[PDB]
Amino acid sequence: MYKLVLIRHGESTWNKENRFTGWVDVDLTEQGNREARQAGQLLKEAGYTFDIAYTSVLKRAIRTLWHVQDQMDLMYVPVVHSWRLNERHYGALSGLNKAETAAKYGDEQVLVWRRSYDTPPPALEPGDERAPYADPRYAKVPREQLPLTECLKDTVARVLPLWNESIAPAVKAGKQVLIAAHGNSLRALIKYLDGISDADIVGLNIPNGVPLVYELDESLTPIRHYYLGD
Ligand code: VO4
């Protein structure tokens, strides 16, 4: 039997400002920092430890991991930072206030952009400042694989290779794994692990900075999962 622990980044500046974020590299608020620290103390107090961690290339997730590591005295463990764990790419909605967007385009249209499994938001223009092509984080990713927008289906397809190629072999080797990532990248993983349908997964909400523990059997099939804390 294996345990795998998941955590969404703490409150980001754009969570506070009610903006779609996607791949824009915004940082944690003081409240986000505190959530991250609290998650680390909770894992420490429950006697959890880790051998390795995976995270995105986005600093809200990485700094969340840093706080967890600091509180746990695990600053020395290997960390794999992967663009494959990045939040779902929100296209031309990245940076827009969610309430002002629904006001302009209507709740129905925004429902689609937030919840349609297979239909992405409107794309960035290739020359947008927010496009990923000149970013050193993605310099070794083939240009064709870099998104200008994503539906959750795209996000799942992008995350799973990291699981197959690295995380699953890590777990099977008896490494105690922590994944510090984002709402939709974690939903993508949870969808695969729990075999959740296209329709069901769209309604799963993961709170900021709460450890989510998965117990897996010999075939990496979930036995049970649960949040730690209150
Ligand atoms: O801006 V979202 O919390 O619907 O990924």
Ligand 1 atom nearest to 184, measured from its CA: 5
Active site residue 87: yes
Residue 141 to residues 67, 82, 88, 137, 138, Cα–Cα distance (Å): 28, 11, 16, 9, 5
- The 3-class SS string of 123-153 reads CCCCCCCCCCCCCHHHCCCCHHHCCCCCCHH
221-224 long-range contacts, CB within 8 A, separation 24+ = 221/193, 222/193, 222/194, 223/1
CA distance 123 to 143: 15
Whether 203 has a binding-site annotation, put simply, is: no
Resolution, rounded to a tenth of an Å? 1.9
Per DSSP, helices labelled H in 1-127 are 13-16, 30-45, 59-72, 98-105, 107-115
CA distance 95 to 110: 15
Active site residue 225: no
54 bridge partner residues? 80, 179
Q: DSSP secondary-structure letter at 20?
A: -
**Domain range list for the chain:** 1-230
CATH architecture of 1-230: 3-Layer(aba) Sandwich (3.40)
Of 4, 6, 8, 5, whose CA–CA distance to 183 is shortest? 8
CA distance 39 to 138: 29
Note the residue count of the chain: 230
| Per-position b or e across 207-224, b if 16+ CB within 10 A of its CB | ebbbbbbbebeeebeeee
Ligand 1 atom nearest to 182, measured from its CA: 5
Which method was it determined by? X-ray
Whether 215 has a binding-site annotation, put simply, is: no
